[PDB]
Each structure stands twice: as structure tokens, then as C-alpha cells.
JSON list of C-alpha atoms in Angstrom, two decimals:
[
{"chain": "G", "resi": 1, "resn": "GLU", "atom": "CA", "xyz": [124.24, 38.90, 100.42]},
{"chain": "G", "resi": 2, "resn": "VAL", "atom": "CA", "xyz": [124.26, 41.26, 103.66]},
{"chain": "G", "resi": 3, "resn": "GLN", "atom": "CA", "xyz": [120.66, 42.40, 104.13]},
{"chain": "G", "resi": 4, "resn": "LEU", "atom": "CA", "xyz": [119.33, 44.85, 107.01]},
{"chain": "G", "resi": 5, "resn": "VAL", "atom": "CA", "xyz": [115.28, 44.87, 107.20]},
{"chain": "G", "resi": 6, "resn": "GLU", "atom": "CA", "xyz": [114.14, 47.97, 109.13]},
{"chain": "G", "resi": 7, "resn": "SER", "atom": "CA", "xyz": [110.37, 47.66, 110.28]},
{"chain": "G", "resi": 8, "resn": "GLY", "atom": "CA", "xyz": [107.87, 49.52, 113.17]},
{"chain": "G", "resi": 9, "resn": "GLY", "atom": "CA", "xyz": [107.59, 52.84, 111.61]},
{"chain": "G", "resi": 10, "resn": "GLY", "atom": "CA", "xyz": [104.47, 54.91, 111.73]},
{"chain": "G", "resi": 11, "resn": "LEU", "atom": "CA", "xyz": [102.63, 57.73, 112.20]},
{"chain": "G", "resi": 12, "resn": "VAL", "atom": "CA", "xyz": [102.85, 58.87, 116.01]},
{"chain": "G", "resi": 13, "resn": "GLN", "atom": "CA", "xyz": [101.26, 61.61, 118.24]},
{"chain": "G", "resi": 14, "resn": "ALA", "atom": "CA", "xyz": [103.98, 63.68, 119.60]},
{"chain": "G", "resi": 15, "resn": "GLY", "atom": "CA", "xyz": [104.35, 62.16, 123.11]},
{"chain": "G", "resi": 16, "resn": "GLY", "atom": "CA", "xyz": [103.77, 58.72, 121.83]},
{"chain": "G", "resi": 17, "resn": "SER", "atom": "CA", "xyz": [105.86, 55.59, 121.43]},
{"chain": "G", "resi": 18, "resn": "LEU", "atom": "CA", "xyz": [107.30, 53.40, 118.82]},
{"chain": "G", "resi": 19, "resn": "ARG", "atom": "CA", "xyz": [109.26, 50.77, 118.29]},
{"chain": "G", "resi": 20, "resn": "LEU", "atom": "CA", "xyz": [111.37, 50.28, 115.28]},
{"chain": "G", "resi": 21, "resn": "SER", "atom": "CA", "xyz": [113.29, 46.98, 114.31]},
{"chain": "G", "resi": 22, "resn": "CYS", "atom": "CA", "xyz": [116.10, 45.69, 112.06]},
{"chain": "G", "resi": 23, "resn": "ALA", "atom": "CA", "xyz": [116.53, 42.43, 111.28]},
{"chain": "G", "resi": 24, "resn": "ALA", "atom": "CA", "xyz": [120.01, 41.38, 109.99]},
{"chain": "G", "resi": 25, "resn": "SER", "atom": "CA", "xyz": [120.67, 38.47, 107.62]},
{"chain": "G", "resi": 26, "resn": "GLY", "atom": "CA", "xyz": [124.02, 37.18, 106.36]},
{"chain": "G", "resi": 27, "resn": "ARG", "atom": "CA", "xyz": [125.77, 37.38, 108.98]},
{"chain": "G", "resi": 28, "resn": "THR", "atom": "CA", "xyz": [125.86, 37.53, 112.25]},
{"chain": "G", "resi": 29, "resn": "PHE", "atom": "CA", "xyz": [126.69, 40.76, 113.71]},
{"chain": "G", "resi": 30, "resn": "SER", "atom": "CA", "xyz": [127.31, 39.73, 117.00]},
{"chain": "G", "resi": 31, "resn": "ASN", "atom": "CA", "xyz": [130.92, 41.38, 117.59]},
{"chain": "G", "resi": 32, "resn": "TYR", "atom": "CA", "xyz": [129.65, 44.95, 115.17]},
{"chain": "G", "resi": 33, "resn": "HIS", "atom": "CA", "xyz": [128.86, 48.00, 116.15]},
{"chain": "G", "resi": 34, "resn": "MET", "atom": "CA", "xyz": [125.39, 48.88, 115.58]},
{"chain": "G", "resi": 35, "resn": "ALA", "atom": "CA", "xyz": [123.16, 52.51, 115.17]},
{"chain": "G", "resi": 36, "resn": "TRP", "atom": "CA", "xyz": [120.45, 53.85, 113.82]},
{"chain": "G", "resi": 37, "resn": "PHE", "atom": "CA", "xyz": [120.68, 57.34, 112.25]},
{"chain": "G", "resi": 38, "resn": "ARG", "atom": "CA", "xyz": [117.96, 59.30, 110.40]},
{"chain": "G", "resi": 39, "resn": "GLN", "atom": "CA", "xyz": [117.53, 61.48, 107.51]},
{"chain": "G", "resi": 40, "resn": "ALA", "atom": "CA", "xyz": [114.38, 64.01, 106.66]},
{"chain": "G", "resi": 41, "resn": "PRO", "atom": "CA", "xyz": [113.71, 65.16, 103.43]},
{"chain": "G", "resi": 42, "resn": "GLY", "atom": "CA", "xyz": [116.40, 67.59, 101.86]},
{"chain": "G", "resi": 43, "resn": "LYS", "atom": "CA", "xyz": [118.21, 67.46, 105.40]},
{"chain": "G", "resi": 44, "resn": "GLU", "atom": "CA", "xyz": [121.92, 65.49, 106.21]},
{"chain": "G", "resi": 45, "resn": "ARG", "atom": "CA", "xyz": [121.58, 61.72, 107.67]},
{"chain": "G", "resi": 46, "resn": "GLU", "atom": "CA", "xyz": [122.25, 62.28, 111.45]},
{"chain": "G", "resi": 47, "resn": "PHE", "atom": "CA", "xyz": [123.37, 59.42, 114.36]},
{"chain": "G", "resi": 48, "resn": "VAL", "atom": "CA", "xyz": [120.61, 58.83, 116.22]},
{"chain": "G", "resi": 49, "resn": "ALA", "atom": "CA", "xyz": [121.62, 55.87, 118.81]},
{"chain": "G", "resi": 50, "resn": "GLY", "atom": "CA", "xyz": [124.55, 53.08, 119.09]},
{"chain": "G", "resi": 51, "resn": "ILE", "atom": "CA", "xyz": [124.89, 49.94, 120.90]},
{"chain": "G", "resi": 52, "resn": "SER", "atom": "CA", "xyz": [128.34, 48.05, 121.54]},
{"chain": "G", "resi": 53, "resn": "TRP", "atom": "CA", "xyz": [129.77, 44.93, 120.27]},
{"chain": "G", "resi": 54, "resn": "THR", "atom": "CA", "xyz": [129.96, 44.48, 124.24]},
{"chain": "G", "resi": 55, "resn": "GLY", "atom": "CA", "xyz": [125.99, 44.51, 124.23]},
{"chain": "G", "resi": 56, "resn": "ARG", "atom": "CA", "xyz": [126.62, 46.97, 127.20]},
{"chain": "G", "resi": 57, "resn": "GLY", "atom": "CA", "xyz": [127.28, 50.33, 125.49]},
{"chain": "G", "resi": 58, "resn": "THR", "atom": "CA", "xyz": [124.41, 52.69, 124.41]},
{"chain": "G", "resi": 59, "resn": "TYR", "atom": "CA", "xyz": [125.68, 56.36, 123.01]},
{"chain": "G", "resi": 60, "resn": "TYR", "atom": "CA", "xyz": [123.20, 59.01, 121.61]},
{"chain": "G", "resi": 61, "resn": "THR", "atom": "CA", "xyz": [122.74, 62.15, 120.42]},
{"chain": "G", "resi": 62, "resn": "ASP", "atom": "CA", "xyz": [122.04, 64.68, 122.73]},
{"chain": "G", "resi": 63, "resn": "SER", "atom": "CA", "xyz": [118.06, 65.82, 121.56]},
{"chain": "G", "resi": 64, "resn": "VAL", "atom": "CA", "xyz": [117.55, 61.90, 122.03]},
{"chain": "G", "resi": 65, "resn": "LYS", "atom": "CA", "xyz": [119.05, 61.05, 125.64]},
{"chain": "G", "resi": 66, "resn": "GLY", "atom": "CA", "xyz": [115.86, 59.80, 127.78]},
{"chain": "G", "resi": 67, "resn": "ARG", "atom": "CA", "xyz": [113.40, 59.16, 124.81]},
{"chain": "G", "resi": 68, "resn": "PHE", "atom": "CA", "xyz": [114.84, 56.69, 122.59]},
{"chain": "G", "resi": 69, "resn": "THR", "atom": "CA", "xyz": [116.33, 53.21, 124.11]},
{"chain": "G", "resi": 70, "resn": "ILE", "atom": "CA", "xyz": [118.84, 51.26, 121.38]},
{"chain": "G", "resi": 71, "resn": "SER", "atom": "CA", "xyz": [119.23, 47.64, 122.38]},
{"chain": "G", "resi": 72, "resn": "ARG", "atom": "CA", "xyz": [120.02, 44.46, 120.53]},
{"chain": "G", "resi": 73, "resn": "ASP", "atom": "CA", "xyz": [119.55, 40.78, 120.65]},
{"chain": "G", "resi": 74, "resn": "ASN", "atom": "CA", "xyz": [122.40, 38.62, 119.29]},
{"chain": "G", "resi": 75, "resn": "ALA", "atom": "CA", "xyz": [120.42, 35.38, 119.06]},
{"chain": "G", "resi": 76, "resn": "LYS", "atom": "CA", "xyz": [117.89, 36.66, 116.62]},
{"chain": "G", "resi": 77, "resn": "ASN", "atom": "CA", "xyz": [120.60, 38.85, 115.00]},
{"chain": "G", "resi": 78, "resn": "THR", "atom": "CA", "xyz": [118.04, 42.39, 115.64]},
{"chain": "G", "resi": 79, "resn": "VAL", "atom": "CA", "xyz": [118.78, 45.60, 116.70]},
{"chain": "G", "resi": 80, "resn": "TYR", "atom": "CA", "xyz": [115.45, 48.06, 118.23]},
{"chain": "G", "resi": 81, "resn": "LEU", "atom": "CA", "xyz": [115.07, 51.58, 118.24]},
{"chain": "G", "resi": 82, "resn": "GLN", "atom": "CA", "xyz": [112.58, 52.44, 121.47]},
{"chain": "G", "resi": 83, "resn": "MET", "atom": "CA", "xyz": [111.31, 55.54, 120.90]},
{"chain": "G", "resi": 84, "resn": "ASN", "atom": "CA", "xyz": [109.03, 57.10, 123.68]},
{"chain": "G", "resi": 85, "resn": "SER", "atom": "CA", "xyz": [108.51, 61.12, 123.77]},
{"chain": "G", "resi": 86, "resn": "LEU", "atom": "CA", "xyz": [108.29, 61.72, 120.76]},
{"chain": "G", "resi": 87, "resn": "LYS", "atom": "CA", "xyz": [108.83, 65.30, 119.18]},
{"chain": "G", "resi": 88, "resn": "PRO", "atom": "CA", "xyz": [108.37, 66.91, 115.88]},
{"chain": "G", "resi": 89, "resn": "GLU", "atom": "CA", "xyz": [112.18, 66.78, 115.48]},
{"chain": "G", "resi": 90, "resn": "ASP", "atom": "CA", "xyz": [112.19, 62.83, 115.32]},
{"chain": "G", "resi": 91, "resn": "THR", "atom": "CA", "xyz": [110.27, 62.64, 111.67]},
{"chain": "G", "resi": 92, "resn": "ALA", "atom": "CA", "xyz": [112.49, 61.11, 109.82]},
{"chain": "G", "resi": 93, "resn": "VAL", "atom": "CA", "xyz": [113.81, 57.92, 107.59]},
{"chain": "G", "resi": 94, "resn": "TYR", "atom": "CA", "xyz": [115.73, 55.78, 110.45]},
{"chain": "G", "resi": 95, "resn": "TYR", "atom": "CA", "xyz": [118.23, 53.38, 108.73]},
{"chain": "G", "resi": 96, "resn": "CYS", "atom": "CA", "xyz": [119.89, 51.02, 110.80]},
{"chain": "G", "resi": 97, "resn": "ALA", "atom": "CA", "xyz": [123.40, 50.37, 110.02]},
{"chain": "G", "resi": 98, "resn": "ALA", "atom": "CA", "xyz": [126.33, 47.86, 111.02]},
{"chain": "G", "resi": 99, "resn": "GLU", "atom": "CA", "xyz": [129.56, 48.88, 112.10]},
{"chain": "G", "resi": 100, "resn": "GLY", "atom": "CA", "xyz": [132.35, 49.24, 108.47]},
{"chain": "G", "resi": 101, "resn": "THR", "atom": "CA", "xyz": [135.89, 48.79, 107.81]},
{"chain": "G", "resi": 102, "resn": "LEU", "atom": "CA", "xyz": [136.95, 52.62, 108.06]},
{"chain": "G", "resi": 103, "resn": "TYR", "atom": "CA", "xyz": [134.90, 52.48, 112.22]},
{"chain": "G", "resi": 104, "resn": "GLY", "atom": "CA", "xyz": [138.52, 53.31, 113.78]},
{"chain": "G", "resi": 105, "resn": "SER", "atom": "CA", "xyz": [139.03, 56.17, 111.60]},
{"chain": "G", "resi": 106, "resn": "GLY", "atom": "CA", "xyz": [135.47, 57.82, 111.58]},
{"chain": "G", "resi": 107, "resn": "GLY", "atom": "CA", "xyz": [134.20, 57.17, 115.02]},
{"chain": "G", "resi": 108, "resn": "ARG", "atom": "CA", "xyz": [130.37, 56.07, 116.00]},
{"chain": "G", "resi": 109, "resn": "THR", "atom": "CA", "xyz": [128.27, 59.01, 115.37]},
{"chain": "G", "resi": 110, "resn": "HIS", "atom": "CA", "xyz": [129.69, 59.44, 111.40]},
{"chain": "G", "resi": 111, "resn": "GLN", "atom": "CA", "xyz": [128.06, 58.04, 108.40]},
{"chain": "G", "resi": 112, "resn": "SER", "atom": "CA", "xyz": [131.24, 56.44, 106.94]},
{"chain": "G", "resi": 113, "resn": "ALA", "atom": "CA", "xyz": [131.83, 54.32, 110.05]},
{"chain": "G", "resi": 114, "resn": "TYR", "atom": "CA", "xyz": [129.21, 51.98, 108.65]},
{"chain": "G", "resi": 115, "resn": "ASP", "atom": "CA", "xyz": [129.54, 49.76, 105.76]},
{"chain": "G", "resi": 116, "resn": "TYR", "atom": "CA", "xyz": [125.76, 48.14, 105.95]},
{"chain": "G", "resi": 117, "resn": "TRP", "atom": "CA", "xyz": [122.09, 49.61, 105.80]},
{"chain": "G", "resi": 118, "resn": "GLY", "atom": "CA", "xyz": [118.84, 49.02, 105.65]},
{"chain": "G", "resi": 119, "resn": "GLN", "atom": "CA", "xyz": [116.39, 50.63, 103.48]},
{"chain": "G", "resi": 120, "resn": "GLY", "atom": "CA", "xyz": [114.81, 52.73, 105.94]},
{"chain": "G", "resi": 121, "resn": "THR", "atom": "CA", "xyz": [111.54, 52.89, 107.82]},
{"chain": "G", "resi": 122, "resn": "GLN", "atom": "CA", "xyz": [109.02, 56.13, 107.87]},
{"chain": "G", "resi": 123, "resn": "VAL", "atom": "CA", "xyz": [108.55, 57.61, 111.44]},
{"chain": "G", "resi": 124, "resn": "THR", "atom": "CA", "xyz": [106.27, 60.74, 111.03]},
{"chain": "G", "resi": 125, "resn": "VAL", "atom": "CA", "xyz": [105.47, 62.56, 114.13]},
{"chain": "G", "resi": 126, "resn": "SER", "atom": "CA", "xyz": [102.10, 64.93, 113.95]},
{"chain": "G", "resi": 127, "resn": "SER", "atom": "CA", "xyz": [103.16, 68.29, 114.29]},
{"chain": "B", "resi": 1, "resn": "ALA", "atom": "CA", "xyz": [135.30, 33.21, 103.90]},
{"chain": "B", "resi": 2, "resn": "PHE", "atom": "CA", "xyz": [137.90, 35.78, 104.68]},
{"chain": "B", "resi": 3, "resn": "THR", "atom": "CA", "xyz": [138.01, 34.44, 108.66]},
{"chain": "B", "resi": 4, "resn": "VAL", "atom": "CA", "xyz": [139.95, 35.36, 111.39]},
{"chain": "B", "resi": 5, "resn": "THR", "atom": "CA", "xyz": [141.65, 33.02, 113.87]},
{"chain": "B", "resi": 6, "resn": "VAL", "atom": "CA", "xyz": [142.81, 33.90, 117.68]},
{"chain": "B", "resi": 7, "resn": "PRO", "atom": "CA", "xyz": [145.01, 31.02, 118.88]},
{"chain": "B", "resi": 8, "resn": "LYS", "atom": "CA", "xyz": [143.84, 32.44, 122.54]},
{"chain": "B", "resi": 9, "resn": "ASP", "atom": "CA", "xyz": [140.50, 34.01, 123.31]},
{"chain": "B", "resi": 10, "resn": "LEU", "atom": "CA", "xyz": [141.35, 34.39, 126.56]},
{"chain": "B", "resi": 11, "resn": "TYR", "atom": "CA", "xyz": [144.82, 36.25, 128.23]},
{"chain": "B", "resi": 12, "resn": "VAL", "atom": "CA", "xyz": [145.80, 35.90, 132.12]},
{"chain": "B", "resi": 13, "resn": "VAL", "atom": "CA", "xyz": [148.79, 38.49, 133.01]},
{"chain": "B", "resi": 14, "resn": "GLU", "atom": "CA", "xyz": [150.65, 39.83, 135.63]},
{"chain": "B", "resi": 15, "resn": "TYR", "atom": "CA", "xyz": [150.16, 43.64, 136.83]},
{"chain": "B", "resi": 16, "resn": "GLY", "atom": "CA", "xyz": [153.28, 44.78, 135.30]},
{"chain": "B", "resi": 17, "resn": "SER", "atom": "CA", "xyz": [154.25, 42.61, 132.58]},
{"chain": "B", "resi": 18, "resn": "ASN", "atom": "CA", "xyz": [153.90, 43.35, 128.92]},
{"chain": "B", "resi": 19, "resn": "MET", "atom": "CA", "xyz": [151.41, 41.44, 126.84]},
{"chain": "B", "resi": 20, "resn": "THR", "atom": "CA", "xyz": [151.19, 40.37, 123.27]},
{"chain": "B", "resi": 21, "resn": "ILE", "atom": "CA", "xyz": [147.80, 39.54, 121.87]},
{"chain": "B", "resi": 22, "resn": "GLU", "atom": "CA", "xyz": [147.20, 38.00, 118.50]},
{"chain": "B", "resi": 23, "resn": "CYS", "atom": "CA", "xyz": [145.11, 37.83, 115.93]},
{"chain": "B", "resi": 24, "resn": "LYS", "atom": "CA", "xyz": [145.76, 35.77, 112.69]},
{"chain": "B", "resi": 25, "resn": "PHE", "atom": "CA", "xyz": [144.45, 36.32, 109.20]},
{"chain": "B", "resi": 26, "resn": "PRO", "atom": "CA", "xyz": [145.52, 34.46, 105.73]},
{"chain": "B", "resi": 27, "resn": "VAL", "atom": "CA", "xyz": [148.71, 36.13, 104.31]},
{"chain": "B", "resi": 28, "resn": "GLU", "atom": "CA", "xyz": [151.07, 34.31, 101.32]},
{"chain": "B", "resi": 29, "resn": "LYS", "atom": "CA", "xyz": [152.77, 37.61, 99.95]},
{"chain": "B", "resi": 30, "resn": "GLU", "atom": "CA", "xyz": [153.34, 41.10, 99.94]},
{"chain": "B", "resi": 31, "resn": "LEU", "atom": "CA", "xyz": [150.68, 43.03, 102.19]},
{"chain": "B", "resi": 32, "resn": "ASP", "atom": "CA", "xyz": [148.55, 44.98, 99.93]},
{"chain": "B", "resi": 33, "resn": "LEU", "atom": "CA", "xyz": [148.71, 47.99, 102.43]},
{"chain": "B", "resi": 34, "resn": "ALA", "atom": "CA", "xyz": [146.40, 49.93, 100.47]},
{"chain": "B", "resi": 35, "resn": "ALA", "atom": "CA", "xyz": [143.51, 47.45, 101.55]},
{"chain": "B", "resi": 36, "resn": "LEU", "atom": "CA", "xyz": [144.70, 46.37, 104.44]},
{"chain": "B", "resi": 37, "resn": "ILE", "atom": "CA", "xyz": [142.95, 47.50, 107.95]},
{"chain": "B", "resi": 38, "resn": "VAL", "atom": "CA", "xyz": [143.60, 46.56, 111.08]},
{"chain": "B", "resi": 39, "resn": "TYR", "atom": "CA", "xyz": [141.54, 48.54, 114.26]},
{"chain": "B", "resi": 40, "resn": "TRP", "atom": "CA", "xyz": [142.10, 47.08, 117.98]},
{"chain": "B", "resi": 41, "resn": "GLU", "atom": "CA", "xyz": [139.33, 48.32, 120.43]},
{"chain": "B", "resi": 42, "resn": "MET", "atom": "CA", "xyz": [139.08, 47.38, 124.05]},
{"chain": "B", "resi": 43, "resn": "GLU", "atom": "CA", "xyz": [135.69, 48.13, 125.76]},
{"chain": "B", "resi": 44, "resn": "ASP", "atom": "CA", "xyz": [134.71, 50.92, 123.30]},
{"chain": "B", "resi": 45, "resn": "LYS", "atom": "CA", "xyz": [138.43, 52.33, 123.34]},
{"chain": "B", "resi": 46, "resn": "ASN", "atom": "CA", "xyz": [140.58, 52.92, 120.70]},
{"chain": "B", "resi": 47, "resn": "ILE", "atom": "CA", "xyz": [143.64, 51.13, 120.57]},
{"chain": "B", "resi": 48, "resn": "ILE", "atom": "CA", "xyz": [145.11, 51.22, 117.13]},
{"chain": "B", "resi": 49, "resn": "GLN", "atom": "CA", "xyz": [143.51, 52.16, 113.89]},
{"chain": "B", "resi": 50, "resn": "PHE", "atom": "CA", "xyz": [146.13, 50.86, 111.27]},
{"chain": "B", "resi": 51, "resn": "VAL", "atom": "CA", "xyz": [144.78, 52.21, 107.35]},
{"chain": "B", "resi": 52, "resn": "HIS", "atom": "CA", "xyz": [147.00, 53.23, 104.87]},
{"chain": "B", "resi": 53, "resn": "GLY", "atom": "CA", "xyz": [150.22, 51.48, 106.09]},
{"chain": "B", "resi": 54, "resn": "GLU", "atom": "CA", "xyz": [150.07, 54.14, 109.66]},
{"chain": "B", "resi": 55, "resn": "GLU", "atom": "CA", "xyz": [148.56, 54.23, 113.26]},
{"chain": "B", "resi": 56, "resn": "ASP", "atom": "CA", "xyz": [146.12, 57.03, 113.56]},
{"chain": "B", "resi": 57, "resn": "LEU", "atom": "CA", "xyz": [147.00, 58.45, 116.60]},
{"chain": "B", "resi": 58, "resn": "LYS", "atom": "CA", "xyz": [144.86, 61.24, 115.91]},
{"chain": "B", "resi": 59, "resn": "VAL", "atom": "CA", "xyz": [141.79, 58.37, 117.18]},
{"chain": "B", "resi": 60, "resn": "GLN", "atom": "CA", "xyz": [143.89, 56.70, 119.66]},
{"chain": "B", "resi": 61, "resn": "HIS", "atom": "CA", "xyz": [142.19, 56.36, 123.12]},
{"chain": "B", "resi": 62, "resn": "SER", "atom": "CA", "xyz": [144.42, 58.35, 125.88]},
{"chain": "B", "resi": 63, "resn": "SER", "atom": "CA", "xyz": [144.88, 55.32, 127.72]},
{"chain": "B", "resi": 64, "resn": "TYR", "atom": "CA", "xyz": [146.84, 53.87, 124.92]},
{"chain": "B", "resi": 65, "resn": "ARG", "atom": "CA", "xyz": [149.00, 56.32, 124.29]},
{"chain": "B", "resi": 66, "resn": "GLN", "atom": "CA", "xyz": [152.70, 55.47, 123.96]},
{"chain": "B", "resi": 67, "resn": "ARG", "atom": "CA", "xyz": [151.96, 52.61, 125.38]},
{"chain": "B", "resi": 68, "resn": "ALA", "atom": "CA", "xyz": [150.21, 49.82, 122.54]},
{"chain": "B", "resi": 69, "resn": "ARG", "atom": "CA", "xyz": [152.23, 48.69, 119.26]},
{"chain": "B", "resi": 70, "resn": "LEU", "atom": "CA", "xyz": [150.49, 46.86, 116.32]},
{"chain": "B", "resi": 71, "resn": "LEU", "atom": "CA", "xyz": [153.64, 44.77, 115.05]},
{"chain": "B", "resi": 72, "resn": "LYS", "atom": "CA", "xyz": [154.71, 45.65, 111.74]},
{"chain": "B", "resi": 73, "resn": "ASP", "atom": "CA", "xyz": [156.91, 42.73, 111.09]},
{"chain": "B", "resi": 74, "resn": "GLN", "atom": "CA", "xyz": [154.35, 40.29, 112.73]},
{"chain": "B", "resi": 75, "resn": "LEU", "atom": "CA", "xyz": [151.53, 41.60, 110.55]},
{"chain": "B", "resi": 76, "resn": "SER", "atom": "CA", "xyz": [153.93, 40.71, 107.55]},
{"chain": "B", "resi": 77, "resn": "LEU", "atom": "CA", "xyz": [153.41, 36.79, 108.42]},
{"chain": "B", "resi": 78, "resn": "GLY", "atom": "CA", "xyz": [149.32, 37.30, 108.72]},
{"chain": "B", "resi": 79, "resn": "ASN", "atom": "CA", "xyz": [149.95, 38.07, 112.58]},
{"chain": "B", "resi": 80, "resn": "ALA", "atom": "CA", "xyz": [147.88, 41.23, 113.83]},
{"chain": "B", "resi": 81, "resn": "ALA", "atom": "CA", "xyz": [149.50, 40.99, 117.33]},
{"chain": "B", "resi": 82, "resn": "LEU", "atom": "CA", "xyz": [148.78, 44.28, 119.77]},
{"chain": "B", "resi": 83, "resn": "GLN", "atom": "CA", "xyz": [151.67, 44.80, 122.14]},
{"chain": "B", "resi": 84, "resn": "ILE", "atom": "CA", "xyz": [150.55, 46.70, 125.08]},
{"chain": "B", "resi": 85, "resn": "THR", "atom": "CA", "xyz": [153.64, 48.16, 127.73]},
{"chain": "B", "resi": 86, "resn": "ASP", "atom": "CA", "xyz": [153.27, 47.52, 131.46]},
{"chain": "B", "resi": 87, "resn": "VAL", "atom": "CA", "xyz": [149.68, 45.95, 131.99]},
{"chain": "B", "resi": 88, "resn": "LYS", "atom": "CA", "xyz": [147.29, 47.49, 134.68]},
{"chain": "B", "resi": 89, "resn": "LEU", "atom": "CA", "xyz": [143.87, 46.73, 135.77]},
{"chain": "B", "resi": 90, "resn": "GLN", "atom": "CA", "xyz": [142.30, 48.92, 133.66]},
{"chain": "B", "resi": 91, "resn": "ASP", "atom": "CA", "xyz": [143.94, 46.77, 130.82]},
{"chain": "B", "resi": 92, "resn": "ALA", "atom": "CA", "xyz": [141.83, 44.40, 132.29]},
{"chain": "B", "resi": 93, "resn": "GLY", "atom": "CA", "xyz": [138.21, 43.94, 129.95]},
{"chain": "B", "resi": 94, "resn": "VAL", "atom": "CA", "xyz": [136.96, 42.30, 126.35]},
{"chain": "B", "resi": 95, "resn": "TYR", "atom": "CA", "xyz": [139.18, 43.12, 123.43]},
{"chain": "B", "resi": 96, "resn": "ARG", "atom": "CA", "xyz": [138.17, 43.09, 120.06]},
{"chain": "B", "resi": 97, "resn": "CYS", "atom": "CA", "xyz": [140.17, 42.67, 116.96]},
{"chain": "B", "resi": 98, "resn": "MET", "atom": "CA", "xyz": [139.10, 43.87, 113.43]},
{"chain": "B", "resi": 99, "resn": "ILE", "atom": "CA", "xyz": [140.90, 42.96, 110.12]},
{"chain": "B", "resi": 100, "resn": "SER", "atom": "CA", "xyz": [139.91, 44.05, 106.78]},
{"chain": "B", "resi": 101, "resn": "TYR", "atom": "CA", "xyz": [142.03, 42.11, 103.77]},
{"chain": "B", "resi": 102, "resn": "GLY", "atom": "CA", "xyz": [139.79, 41.47, 100.80]},
{"chain": "B", "resi": 103, "resn": "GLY", "atom": "CA", "xyz": [136.41, 41.20, 103.37]},
{"chain": "B", "resi": 104, "resn": "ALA", "atom": "CA", "xyz": [136.01, 41.64, 107.19]},
{"chain": "B", "resi": 105, "resn": "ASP", "atom": "CA", "xyz": [136.13, 40.01, 110.19]},
{"chain": "B", "resi": 106, "resn": "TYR", "atom": "CA", "xyz": [135.61, 40.27, 114.42]},
{"chain": "B", "resi": 107, "resn": "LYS", "atom": "CA", "xyz": [137.20, 38.53, 117.00]},
{"chain": "B", "resi": 108, "resn": "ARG", "atom": "CA", "xyz": [136.64, 38.94, 120.74]},
{"chain": "B", "resi": 109, "resn": "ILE", "atom": "CA", "xyz": [139.67, 38.20, 123.55]},
{"chain": "B", "resi": 110, "resn": "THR", "atom": "CA", "xyz": [139.24, 38.48, 127.22]},
{"chain": "B", "resi": 111, "resn": "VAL", "atom": "CA", "xyz": [141.93, 39.69, 129.46]},
{"chain": "B", "resi": 112, "resn": "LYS", "atom": "CA", "xyz": [142.47, 39.33, 133.08]},
{"chain": "B", "resi": 113, "resn": "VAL", "atom": "CA", "xyz": [145.19, 41.02, 134.95]},
{"chain": "B", "resi": 114, "resn": "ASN", "atom": "CA", "xyz": [146.15, 40.26, 138.17]},
{"chain": "B", "resi": 115, "resn": "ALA", "atom": "CA", "xyz": [146.32, 42.28, 141.30]},
{"chain": "B", "resi": 116, "resn": "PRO", "atom": "CA", "xyz": [149.45, 44.18, 142.07]}
]
């Protein structure tokens, strides 16, 4: 019954921009920490960005700080990832994730902290 | 339909007081502690993560070290009661409770602390 659906992925020039969106259904996620993760073929899934349930704390993996911006719209149950200054390192499947029951054990940057995951959207930076 | 309820979503407390803020969930019998998780935060700070019947003090924020308790005997009544000792302006903010007990729910509570 919970579904996260990511959209907005595509092919982009290095230096360019894309906006990812995730539409959540099945329950209201206003009070949940939300995140984007990414995974390249054959590599570990990694944290990209996180936004607090406060609406006013944002968190980024060091390599995307200043390039990517995470935001949310609690009226629409949506999460966004504004990606600027795209780089070869950014090519991956991007997943939006909602807080899981072990968030308080695992921490914001760990996969184990999120119980709900979208199917992912592919971002390819021309490399 | 697992639902957490908060008797109060706003606390106004005096500087230097103890404060206990509450979040309630349905309990009729002995808790299954293998399944129960209680997680209190304020302002993205880990106050108490209670899992496998113990506070995980490794992940607790330094601002709450030896100042916060999850009252275990209240938990047996379906009351996740967070007690803060000796409240200060730093303890004013938005708190959130999470309970997971066959389903999970999350509630926000504003705490206002008055001047010393």
C-alpha cells in the first residue's frame, strides 16, 4: 500500500542540471525523514541527500554539497532532488527513501534507516 | 490503523523544571519487546532510541546524556513518557515521538521553555 515513485531521470551533459521528483502514496510522510540514495552498477548503494521531518534540516554527502538540493512538499507528499553541476560520478539509479523503524539505530546516511524505497530513476551523465 | 496519540502537542515549561512529555499507543498486555521500538528526537537530535528492550546510548546526542529517560513502567501502560531533567533554553524546540509496535506512527510536540 505504500508506494514511492521517482521520475525525472535522463541523460545530461556534465555541468548540466536535472530535477528528480518522488510522489509518495499510501500514507502521509510529513513526520518522516526522507532521503535520496544512488547506486551504480556493481557498486554499494550510497546516501546522497536527506531532509528532516522539521522541513528545515537538509543533509548532503560531501561530493554533492552545493551541487544538489533536497526539498519536500508535505501538501503533495513529494520529495525533490535539484541536481546542478552534474559530474561523471553522479551516473547511477537514484532512489527516494522514507524513514524506517531503525532510523534511530542506523543514522541518516545508512540504508538500514529507511523502510520504504522507490523503484529508482536512472541518471546518466555523458562521460 | 496503528495510531500514536499525544495528550498534549504543546508544553510550556519553566527553566530548571523537570518535564515529562507523553505519547500513547495501544497496549493491553505484556509488551513484546522483541518488536517494540520507541524513538524520541528533538530538532534532528537523537534523544532515546529504545530497541530490544534497551536505550541505545551510543547514538544519543550529547545534549541528552544523563538528562533523558524513557520511563519503562509507563511503557508497560502504552505511555512512551520522555523525562528531561533540569530543562534549559536548549530543550525548547520541536520534539517527535516514533513508536513501532506492529505498525509505526510519528507525532510532533512543541516545547516552549520560559526564561531563567
